[model samples]
Target: GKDYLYDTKEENGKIISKVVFLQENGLLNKQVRYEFQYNENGKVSEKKAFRWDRTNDEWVPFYQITYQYDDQSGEIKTNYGMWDKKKKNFSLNVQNMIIPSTNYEEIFS
Candidate 1:
């Protein structure tokens, strides 16, 4: 069996995130790093970029997303996504919604 593990550390060297990928053997075939940024309101305004690379390969930046929020309803109004090969230009993937409900029980139950 193989298993893939991902771990992130802060600049100060404290672990901030971890993810595990289950497989049949002990070697990791894939890995990714996620960077998160929070706004003054303590909400995520921008999600860190992502890159995908083969095992033991260099990371090639691929995707990014930005969030727009409405203070009155505390809803996210827009989610813009961009692919790096497009030279960092973002296009709207979603907009003008009540921020998709986070109530997972309704969907999974």
Candidate 2:
């Protein structure tokens, strides 16, 4: 089986979604997919990860993370969570983490 296979979707040079698959025999088995959302400033606002549910023929949400700017620190704040299908929302398992916002333009570029 092939360990690393990637398929990426992009719009205007920004990555929209990335898919990973494992090639077993003649079949491409879907492993995981990550979706991205950007704010008006081109900062990544949210990211979601999903798993392929073969039985349902769908992508089921696995994890979600959100980012926002901190007014006081001028830094990016983060919230990491797991998807809760019953609540149709992410359970914020971790939050208040900070990422420096100064070099984002260089980082994203």
Candidate 3:
């Protein structure tokens, strides 16, 4: 039997975002959500991860990744960053590199 559940939001029949949760007896115990932003060409511009804080009953920023695309060269630059609570923005880390594609689930999983 499946013990996990997912909830998704779609735009124009395309999944824009989704949340994954672990439940016990149909009661949610843990949850993580992902949000996506797309560019004009329908490529993912940015991806954000959040964790549900049961104490605050709110989603708090966990991690963030931004993608830079070069239309002419057809190259993709991916930046890995962490949410800076003080500045309220993502602080780019030194791990930036050019990755053709990213597996968003691997990081959180």
lDDT of 2 at 60: 98
What tens digits encode model 3's per-residue C-alpha lDDT throughout 34-106? 9888878776777898888888889999778878877575457878788788888787453686754445334
Candidate 3: minimum summed lDDT over ten consecutive residues — where?
A: 100-109
TM-score of 2: 0.73
Clashes of each: 5, 0, 0
Where does the lowest 10-residue lDDT sum fall in candidate 1? 100-109
Off by over 4 Å in 2: 23-27, 70-75, 92-96, 99-109
Scored by lDDT, the top model is 2
- Residues 1-109 of candidate 2 have per-residue lDDT tens digits of 5666889898997988888898888788899898989988877888888999999989999988778875588788777888877988887465556778886543222
- Candidate 1 lDDT tens digits, 1-109: 5565545555453333333343555544444555555567654555544555556465554444455666466455545465545555544343333454353112111
Span of 10 residues, lowest total lDDT, candidate 2: 100-109
lDDT of 3 at 36: 85
Clashing pairs in 1: 1-24, 1-25, 2-23, 2-24, 2-25
Q: In candidate 3, which residue ranges exceed 4 Å CA deviation?
A: 24-27, 70-75, 92-94, 102-109
TM-score pick, better of 1 and 2 = 2
